[PDB]
């Protein structure tokens, strides 16, 4: 009765979502054949959120899995938890779309979104009280952006109060994995600003710096980047699925974040991560734990908060933990380091603690940060956009379905407005 529905779009969205159901199957203890084989009763205490219940005693994840590329479709199907999914919400087309953002909204996106929302409607009207929707995708590919933002747009037509919790993957600062990534980013975030409520920005270069330096992992594969992403994935829904002395579902984690309806781009983070060679050299206490939360190194978005002010900050917590110092230390990080928080939000940072740990650590936490330093991530990509658009770099692929030059104008104008808002509230 505070149920949320899962959404996966694009190859990056599928593999992140696949490894999310790897993780949730550990704290909820659901085996790859779906059955309960855990120990604690608190484990199946709020399983109704990410799962629906059972004919025969198993828990299929409520995850519609859309991707027009079938190569990632059987790749997740053949994974270790591809069996736990249901074949019904394996919605996919045999045809391919090579970063065709026009095709992803008007001709083949339109012919597929009816099939996709025929699944999403089934999983939304079948619940006592829907709390919201949440989607994981990439801003670079055409299926991550085109199918991603089209599903965000048409859901909001009939859902007034159900929040949308997008988990976004932004192109990297140093290099790109696709040359048309600024094009597929700018057009997609033109639909993310109006229609989403939380957009968690994940950066690949940020994940590399956490893995190489803090985790001391020389060769992190995609089974390791997604697990850091999946830590925050379960981190935002901690209190919603388990009891705590101060709970916070997604929706009081929304009003406590967004001052105005367009400032909803957040920095995710996981606090207690340390390399194997130095587990026994660092003491796991919440004074030590929340420092690694707030350093610029353990930030999953690759833009330095030192170049801006935090607007609103939360830190969700787990484990049997003292409430005095989690309250008194977040006094201390506000007040002694006060030039990097906005002065017009005095009681800036909130806490949201939980009684149960994750599987592996005695106490843990997950960082969410809404700062005005993320406009640099949007200022530099408008610069990456205005270099291509002044020469009409790759316009003739996008005009395959007759989307005009006029649509790119407000696509770029939405960013210049958004950056102008972020610079306006930087200086109050």
């Amino acid at each position: 009765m505070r149920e949320i529905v899962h959404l996966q779009a694009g190859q990056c969205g599928n593999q992140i979502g696949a490894k999310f159901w790897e993780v949730i199957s550990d704290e909820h203890g659901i085996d790859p054949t779906g059955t309960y084989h855990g120990d604690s009763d608190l484990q199946l205490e709020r399983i109704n959120v990410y799962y629906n219940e059972a004919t025969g005693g198993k828990y299929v994840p409520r995850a519609v899995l859309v991707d027009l590329e079938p190569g990632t479709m059987d790749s997740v199907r053949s994974g270790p938890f591809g069996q736990i999914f249901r074949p019904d919400n394996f919605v996919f087309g045999q045809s391919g779309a090579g970063n065709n953002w026009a095709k992803g909204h008007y001709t083949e996106g339109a012919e597929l979104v009816d099939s996709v929302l025929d699944v999403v409607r089934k999983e939304a009207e079948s619940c006592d009280c829907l709390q919201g929707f949440q989607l994981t995708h990439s801003l670079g590919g055409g299926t991550g952006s085109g199918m991603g933002t089209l599903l965000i747009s048409k859901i909001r037509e009939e859902y007034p109060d159900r929040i949308m919790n997008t988990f976004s993957v932004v192109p990297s600062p140093k290099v790109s994995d696709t040359v048309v990534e600024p094009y597929n980013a700018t057009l997609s975030v033109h639909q993310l600003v109006e229609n989403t409520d939380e957009t968690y920005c994940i950066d690949n270069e940020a994940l590399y710096d956490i893995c190489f330096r803090t985790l001391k992992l020389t060769t992190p594969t995609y089974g390791d980047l997604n697990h850091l992403v999946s830590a925050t994935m379960s981190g935002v829904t901690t209190c919603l699925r388990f009891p705590g002395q101060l709970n916070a579902d997604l929706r009081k984690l929304a009003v406590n974040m967004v001052p105005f309806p367009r400032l909803h781009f957040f920095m995710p983070g996981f606090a207690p991560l340390t390399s194997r060679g130095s587990q026994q050299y660092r003491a796991l206490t919440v004074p030590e734990l929340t420092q690694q939360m707030f350093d610029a190194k353990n930030m999953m978005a690759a833009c330095d908060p030192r170049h801006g002010r935090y607007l609103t900050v939360a830190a969700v917590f787990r484990g049997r933990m003292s409430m005095k110092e989690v309250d008194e230390q977040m006094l201390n990080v506000q007040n002694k380091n006060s030039s990097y928080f906005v002065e017009w939000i005095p009681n800036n940072v909130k806490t949201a603690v939980c009684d149960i740990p994750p599987r592996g650590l005695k106490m843990s936490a997950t960082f969410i940060g809404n700062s005005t330093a993320i406009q640099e991530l949007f200022k530099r990509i408008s610069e990456q956009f205005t270099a291509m658009f002044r020469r009409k770099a790759f316009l003739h692929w996008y005009t395959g379905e007759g989307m005009d030059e006029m649509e790119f104008t407000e696509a770029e104008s939405n960013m210049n407005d958004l950056v102008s808002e972020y610079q306006q509230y930087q200086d109050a």
């Binding site: 004074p287 420092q291 707030f294 908060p305 030192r306 110092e325 008194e328 230390q329 201390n332 002694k336």
Partner: peptide, 15 residues
């Protein structure tokens, strides 16, 4: 701010 030096003082990390 003016914590007592008779007991523990609690830490003061920056960013």
């Amino acid at each position: 701010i003016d914590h007592d030096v008779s007991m523990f003082q609690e830490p003061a990390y920056t960013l």
